[PDB]
Design a protein around this ligand. Structure first.
Ligand code: SRM
Ligand code: SF4
Ligand SMILES: [C-]#N
Ligand SMILES: [K+]
Length: 456
């Protein structure tokens, strides 16, 4: 197991070929696994640092996890600056010993593809005239829980305020050091920032950040999100450039019989003009394709099975690695997701909602890597073949789903969904998501204050 530090998920075609070769020759699994934090992992490594270092890459005492950046913004021009900032925060944060891991993101509204509420520190980009002017700071997200331990909880990030672009690094350092100093000195399960904020209070933590940073936050500037999914297919970028986002199930890049996914990405890597962008949804964007090159790239991606059409449901579903490589795994996730969604697709079709989607995620244990705690329907592994079923999150990812059923099996999960999806398909309002519906319809109580009302 090796994971790369790759701010914003941007990787060159040169870097890609070097990782493709290594994955294939020097690992047990021979795969490249894109993670939901915009980076990649090798599994079963049998030198990697020299191979990484040779292409200008590095694997991260350091609790600083990969800094994410919205991968394919609607306002395409904003990416360059937001990305430059994710990269600056990432290096600025490189070695203070943190009590727990620290996760940071740079978000470009209206997209919350990076799932900001699962992170400790978030910089929401505010732009004027196509130029970034500052960031709204949101602090305190974290999804990890421990089964039956009501002292642990998933929490959403809290708004601190707006800061001019110039104070970015000072504010970033201040949040880190304040967490480092105030974090729980005894217990490791209560050391995350989300726990610190609840103990001292947002205003107290905020006041300290201002004092340490040497600034006063300004009122939050308006922002809103419309979704968290990738933009599968071709989208028009700036100039005559196009972006082709490819759906990769579980982000597992391997050559399969008749679906040479891995070779396919290598062939594209060799002819692609720009770079690739690994998304927070475990997908891959072939970025900066000149309009003249669209046909070449598309032919390869099509032949390799990279563009096999899936349902919108499959595109908005996610799972963590889990077995066979994870030692903390309790139930299957990655290996369970495909056929599970096969079942969900049937249910969506049965109800006349094959064109709809429910943000559905499966995490193999309560650590929550699959981000099921921010999904509309989250499955949280409890034992082999058993999961806690959580409902009530929303499409944008700003609400934690409450546990609806505990330690149940797939046939039990499917039966419950068959019933709920049917009520949704028939009772929902115009454009109402599944999650919101279960809350409006009284199927599940919403989680309004995670630290206090997440657990029943
Ligand atoms: C690959 C990935 C899941 C995926 O399918 O994409 C993953 C994989 C692992 N996670 Fe994670 N986590 C991944 C995103 C996250 C997320 C979601 C996110 O960050 O967007 C969470 C939930 C949010 C949060 O942090 O609160 C997450 C919370 C955990 C935890 C709980 C940490 C905590 O604060 O309690 C652990 C275990 C630990 O560190 O104690 C962990 C541990 C692990 C390890 C490294 C197991 C271990 O400790 O040895 C898993 C490796 C499994 C394997 O065999 O590859 N993983 N993990 C993601 C790698 C991210 C990255 O590239 O850096
Ligand atoms: S949620 Fe649990 S099983 Fe899944 S990858 Fe993370 S640690 Fe492993
Ligand atoms: C998980 N890291
Ligand atoms: K994916």
């Amino acid at each position: 197991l090796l994971r790369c530090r790759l701010p914003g998920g941007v990787i060159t075609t040169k870097q890609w070929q070097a990782i493709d070769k290594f994955a294939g020759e020097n690992t047990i699994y021979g795969s490249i696994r894109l993670t939901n934090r915009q980076t990649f992992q090798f599994h079963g490594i049998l030198p990697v640092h020299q191979m990484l270092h040779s292409v200008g890459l590095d694997a991260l005492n350091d609790m600083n996890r990969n800094v994410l950046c919205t991968s394919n913004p609607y306002e395409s021009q904003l990416h360059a600056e937001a990305y430059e900032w994710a990269k600056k925060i990432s290096e600025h944060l490189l070695p203070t010993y943190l009590p727990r891991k620290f996760k940071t993101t740079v978000v470009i509204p209206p997209q919350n593809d990076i799932d900001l509420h699962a992170n400790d520190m978030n910089f929401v980009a505010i732009a004027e005239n196509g130029k970034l002017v500052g960031f709204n700071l949101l602090v305190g997200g974290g999804l990890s829980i421990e089964h039956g331990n009501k002292k642990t909880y998933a929490r959403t990030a809290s708004e601190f305020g707006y800061l001019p672009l110039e104070h970015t690094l000072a504010v970033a350092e201040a949040v880190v050091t304040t967490q480092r100093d105030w974090g729980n000195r005894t217990d490791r399960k209560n050391a995350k920032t989300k726990y610190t904020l609840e103990r001292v209070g947002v205003e107290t933590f905020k006041a300290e950040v201002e004092r340490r940073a040497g600034i006063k936050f300004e009122p939050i500037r308006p922002y809103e999100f419309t979704g968290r999914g990738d933009r599968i297919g071709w989208v028009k970028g700036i100039d005559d450039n196009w972006h082709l986002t490819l759906f990769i199930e579980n982000g597992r890049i391997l050559d399969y019989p008749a679906r040479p996914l891995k070779t396919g990405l290598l062939e594209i890597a060799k002819i692609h003009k720009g770079d690739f962008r690994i998304t927070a949804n475990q997908n891959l964007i072939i970025a900066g394709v000149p309009e003249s090159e669209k046909a070449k790239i598309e032919k390869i991606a099509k032949e390799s099975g990279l563009m096999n059409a899936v349902t919108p449901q499959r595109e908005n579903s996610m799972a963590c690695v889990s077995f066979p490589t994870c030692p903390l795994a309790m139930a299957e996730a990655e290996r369970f997701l495909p056929s599970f969604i096969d079942n969900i697709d049937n249910l969506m079709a049965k109800h006349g909602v094959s064109d709809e989607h429910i943000v559905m995620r499966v995490t193999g244990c309560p650590n929550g890597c699959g981000r099921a705690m921010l999904a509309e329907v989250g499955l949280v592994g409890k034992a082999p073949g058993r999961y806690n079923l959580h409902l009530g999150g929303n499409r944008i990812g700003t609400r934690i789903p409450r546990m609806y059923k505990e330690n149940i099996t797939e046939p039990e999960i499917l039966a419950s969904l068959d019933e709920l999806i049917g009520r949704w398909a028939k009772e929902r309002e115009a454009g109402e998501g599944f999650g919101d519906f279960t809350v409006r319809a009284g199927i599940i109580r919403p989680v309004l204050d995670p630290a206090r009302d997440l657990w029943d």
